[PDB]
Symmetry: none
Subunit: 254 residues, 7 copies
Amino acid sequence: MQIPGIIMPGLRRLTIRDLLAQGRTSSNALEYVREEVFTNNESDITFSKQTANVKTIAHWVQASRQVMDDAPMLQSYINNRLMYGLALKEEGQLLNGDGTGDNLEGLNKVATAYDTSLNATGDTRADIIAHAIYQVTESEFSASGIVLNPRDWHNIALLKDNEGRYIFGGPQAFTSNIMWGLPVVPTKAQAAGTFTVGGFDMASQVFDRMDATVEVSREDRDNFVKNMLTILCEERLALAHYRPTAIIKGTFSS
Amino acid sequence: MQIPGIIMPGLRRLTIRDLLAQGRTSSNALEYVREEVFTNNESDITFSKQTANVKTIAHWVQASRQVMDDAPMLQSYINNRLMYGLALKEEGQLLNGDGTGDNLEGLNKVATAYDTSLNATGDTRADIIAHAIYQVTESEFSASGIVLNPRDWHNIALLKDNEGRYIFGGPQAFTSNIMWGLPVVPTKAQAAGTFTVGGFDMASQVFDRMDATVEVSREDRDNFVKNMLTILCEERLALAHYRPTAIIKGTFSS
Amino acid sequence: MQIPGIIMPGLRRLTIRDLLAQGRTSSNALEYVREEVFTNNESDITFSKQTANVKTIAHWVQASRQVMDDAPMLQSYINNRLMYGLALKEEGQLLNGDGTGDNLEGLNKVATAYDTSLNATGDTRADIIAHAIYQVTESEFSASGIVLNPRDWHNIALLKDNEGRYIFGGPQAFTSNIMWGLPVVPTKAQAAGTFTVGGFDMASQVFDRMDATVEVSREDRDNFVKNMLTILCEERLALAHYRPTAIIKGTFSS
Amino acid sequence: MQIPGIIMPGLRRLTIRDLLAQGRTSSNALEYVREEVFTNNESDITFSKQTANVKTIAHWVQASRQVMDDAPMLQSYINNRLMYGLALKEEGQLLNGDGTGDNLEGLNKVATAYDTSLNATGDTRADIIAHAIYQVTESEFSASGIVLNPRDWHNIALLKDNEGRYIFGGPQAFTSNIMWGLPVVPTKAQAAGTFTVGGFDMASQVFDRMDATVEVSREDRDNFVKNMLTILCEERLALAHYRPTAIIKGTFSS
Amino acid sequence: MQIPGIIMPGLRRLTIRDLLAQGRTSSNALEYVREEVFTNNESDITFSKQTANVKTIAHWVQASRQVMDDAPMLQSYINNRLMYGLALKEEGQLLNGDGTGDNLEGLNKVATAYDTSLNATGDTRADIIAHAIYQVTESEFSASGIVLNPRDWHNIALLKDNEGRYIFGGPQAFTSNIMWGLPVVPTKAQAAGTFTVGGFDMASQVFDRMDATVEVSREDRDNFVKNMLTILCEERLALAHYRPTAIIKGTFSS
Amino acid sequence: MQIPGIIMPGLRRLTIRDLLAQGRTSSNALEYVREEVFTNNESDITFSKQTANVKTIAHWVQASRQVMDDAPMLQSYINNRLMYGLALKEEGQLLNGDGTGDNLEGLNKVATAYDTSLNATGDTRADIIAHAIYQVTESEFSASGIVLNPRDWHNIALLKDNEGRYIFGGPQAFTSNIMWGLPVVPTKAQAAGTFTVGGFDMASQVFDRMDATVEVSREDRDNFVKNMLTILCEERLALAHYRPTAIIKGTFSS
Amino acid sequence: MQIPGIIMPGLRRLTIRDLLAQGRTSSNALEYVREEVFTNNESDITFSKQTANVKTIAHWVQASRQVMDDAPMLQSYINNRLMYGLALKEEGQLLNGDGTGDNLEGLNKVATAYDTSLNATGDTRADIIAHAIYQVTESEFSASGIVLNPRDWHNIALLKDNEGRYIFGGPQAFTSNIMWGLPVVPTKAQAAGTFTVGGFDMASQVFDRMDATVEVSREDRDNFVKNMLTILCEERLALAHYRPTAIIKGTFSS
């Protein structure tokens, strides 16, 4: 359709995407050479010329015919609503990406599973993320941040040690969460009960093929016969995962 | 008319309004999309094109003649009372919107009724709100927050177990009523005994036709002689309700 | 008088005045319209045309002849004493104001009484202030802070459970702030055993007519006859109380 | 001999005298009016016409004539040495005064006794300084700093809560430390086992009659002839104590 | 403002002041050297560095405006009636000088007590004063004068032996206040029954900072109302005591 | 074929490199003087003029044929992988330098072995690091840091006592380590179970001969038949060791 | 040839010198007055004009010949070796100053011997240092710090009670070992088994005549024929000892 003059990234809290390295491409796939499995014990190291396919994320809204024909400001209205919704599913593919059919391969699928052996009789949830922050070290890279579920972070932050003394100072700073001196990501994307820690800033990279643009058709499908309108917001992403060992995913067993 | 430029989100909590998605417009009404019948079993989903009328919210507080003209700084004072007095009534329309005649249709009206079948012998009020957050999921959407009445939130915070300890006490968790971890909005406007859980930021949208303007008359009605004054503040809103199933309304029964 | 407008502000920083809304005027008295009785149940709302008279606050202290002649820097010491002493009695009128005669009506006089019925078998002093914060909700506004007496606050911070652990992040909790996510100003300006919780920031407003000034007499009363000099310090205020229901005053009964 | 261009206290950590308000005067004594006994309950307040005598602190130094003429930079140093030693004994008076004849009446003498009734079954040293910081509230002034003895304050930074983890770790924060969030002062002047909390910048004031200076003559006793030396160093102070209630002094019972 | 050296009616004898040595100073206080203990036998003399503060003596009189402002009238009257009236209270400060707060350190407060061991089996009140005159000697000073109470002096002046002959005659031949060739000084200030003998002309001396100055108020207390006027008379002097042992006070046992 | 100068050298951690003294040279070897054997008992000290050869540290990343042809920004990215990869393997030579054939003589080899003698019945791992910090003293220089393996550091931080309390309230002391008040480095290049303590800043120095230059080949070995590449990134370093006794290498025995 | 300006050498490295008062002169000697005999009981203090000769300390190291002219990396390195090498024996002359002919007289020589009588049956080494800090009081001065040998500090460190708990020394605070609170200096220069306590900052003073100079010779003895390079270090100091009784030197009885 025609040029949506505005491209709005986000508001209140933006986290999952801004953690990864970004760069653009102009192809339908990407090839590179990364380290696959480092079996540290006789030790061995696996390598691969892995392929990273690009997909087409897109969701649409079916506003009235009237909406576009008039479109005094109701156009810009919806134009800022698709760019936002597309970012939600984008944030969902970049993290909890199933890796299945057409879905992207998300941080959580690639990630190396948390080492259950680090847990010790009587560790607090906090202790676990701590252990986790360590497991990243066995890769030989520094952790970048902690991605917990808003609810879980709000149970960990409000955690007082055995002595009642406030550990994280619960209330204090929201969204930045300098847990262990490291910034935390409280996103609703992260499924409750699941936690992710790694050195995102250089373990994976997002590759843009086409900027998020919003187009609107009035002659798509049986719309012209049902008085309907499709407002497609397309986008082509390709999430690479240079180092899996630098990312970890586990589960709180309470 | 004077200068109505006091965009001031109070000094505490931006309630109910900031929970919804906002947008501009310049029309008499708005036709859109809504989820009609979600046949969950092969499953199917129905959508329709509903109408959302734009109502002229004109709140008013009876004043007097002498008061309004004597004080110099009163010019800016009356401005801080009408931009706030309108926001209080705006909340009463946004949440508990009657739907009758000219009133707006608000969250609590549209909302799908809580499912009594989820309760189980011996559940705490907290257990219910939990069941609630789940019901939102039967619509395949994530919940956004919990809207309780300040009083109810207080009693839920002081919940004890069988030994006498305090279960996730909310003394500190007041601003961040974040129940189990979902940022609650202990909004005043919520009727005591009633609770609302939903994915607000993706279920309804507030449409602004005209910024909150403030006017004052002395010759309107029997004011001039009864030493009175009408404090009229006009504003044109329009509350949309895309996905009703995403919002839930229940009642604590005890 | 040859008095400088120099003031070494409350160093440690205090807050009976800083809690309230401030604004200036150039009138003998201020008029407005507040909310009297909000009977929340058929509900009703009472309003009234109220007048907030400007009162001149001027405290003083006498002196000897040896405090007048030399004046190299003693002329400036007496200043810092009255400039501060005027502020001490200021907290006395804005808090425990009698309201009789020429005095001001203070937060504590106007405030609605605490609801004894909220107390429960075995609540901590903290549990009370909690109930208090709620009572403020019955007005439909959020509380802003907690005004306790330095000794009471101290005994609350040092609260212990049945195991022996400390409650409020342990012992150190001085600057009397975030007591349950809410700043709690400590000034025995507040009578011992008495507490005040309310939405100060928008329930009452301080109106200034004239900045504080100092003055000295030599022929004021018994002075000249008894070898004395009376040193004054004038100021003109005007306290308004828009929402009485937003402020609560109770007593720890034990 | 008037010949000692630019001499000021240096090194160390800057305490004291700096904690107190400073001023000039051209008299051998100072008169004022302070508050004696504040009976806070009908309440009453006692006042007294007090006098603060000016006391001289002096001390010469013998250092050969050749070491004066041939050693000019050493002269430049003997000055820095005397200036220091003078200001060192100055600290002694200002803190551990006496009232005895020529000595100054200092902070610790004027001080109000610590209230033994605030202690509770099982308080740590810290807990006490805490109670103390409170006792200063009864005066209705804010505590300014904590004056402990280097060794005591030392045995404080290494104060971990009952659960091994430090209440406050043992970094250093030498004297700039904010115990409880307030500036402390570990001076060897403060007697071991003695602690002083107060609102110094308000409670007392140092009065200078003459700046600290160093002169050279070489005519004292059988010196000018038996080859000895005379290099003086003197000053005239006067410590006043306005509010004694603002200064607290106690003892750690080990 | 116009008459400093006025022909004030001097009670024939300038009584106490005339007995002392007089000087002048333009300072707040005075630093001299007294003699504490003189052991006359190897002999030894003890000295001490003492300080004598300057105080401001003052009294007052009420009078009408017109008659006060007239100028050729009571102006010259009140100027002479006050310089004398002040001399009566000044006379009480130089003798019964409390030595306390604002009071002067008077002759009686310093005196060494009379030596009862000198009294002889049955000797007149006269004999005692004579003994006192001797007791002075052990200071190394000659006694200067005698200070009795008027009534007492009168009775001591009418003393008779066993037959009738006046112990010293006196009627008609009475020269002018002089017993044993020593002045009598009949002062109302000298408490009845008490007597002071010492070497005033050298052992102690008065210290004038300012000649008797007088001001007049009109708006002083309820004067402007009752048509009154307050006439504060000022004068600031001190009193040193170079030899305590030289001054002696006792009590007539009768 | 040159592409990047040096881009951005090191990212997260700067260890062995930054812990050591740096300087550059333009020769193939260096000659200096170090301490050989310190016989501490008559005591003696041996010295030796030693030669520090320049060794070439080169780490390569096997690339694909696709990587080159499709590099509009992909070639730029690979450069950001060799600048960090060379520095990563650099921490492995400057630390675990074998000493065989060409490998550099690294800290761990040169270092004087830990004195098993110091270990005592029942010592925590921390006790050992302490013991080690001491052993450095026998050289007569003080240590400057502790280099443990990230995992080991984690277990040392979560060290509990007999009651269960946490000796070090530093689970967040993950980033950097200030164990025993010393700037420890969690350089994981450090073998698991191996620890290094010394006065690095004064024991060894890194000598740069040539900045990291990069060349690319496609016909080396049997690449052209395997669709591979060899991006040789050469670098010429020279690790000197002035004071071996200042460094210590130990092993936790448990 | 020209030695560059003063570099920051010992990072975290300086005590003995940094402990003493530092002055600066431009003469080859300094005549002050040390305290000869202090008879603490009527007490008396004896003084005597003492000469503090300005000696020139030196320390030499060996080096390369052909690479000297290069610099090109060598001369700049050889510079940083004598700048610190001069400071190694610097503490040796100020601490263990022999006193023989040209040597300096150091703290440990001037010092008053420890009083064996304070030792009590069964005292920890800790107890001794305590006793020591006291013996300094007997001279009537405040102790400044404790100078133990690194090893000794480590043993006083791991001190345990009868149960098995650790007393204090050794842990994190292993730096300025504030034993009790007096900063302990674990310097290498202090002979093993010897301890020095005093009020350094006031007992002695270091006097600088000329900044650190360093010279090089190549024709020195066998050098030119043996391919060697001797390098002396020059500097003019002057250690004065004002109050000897303030310093103490003892020995632990093992």
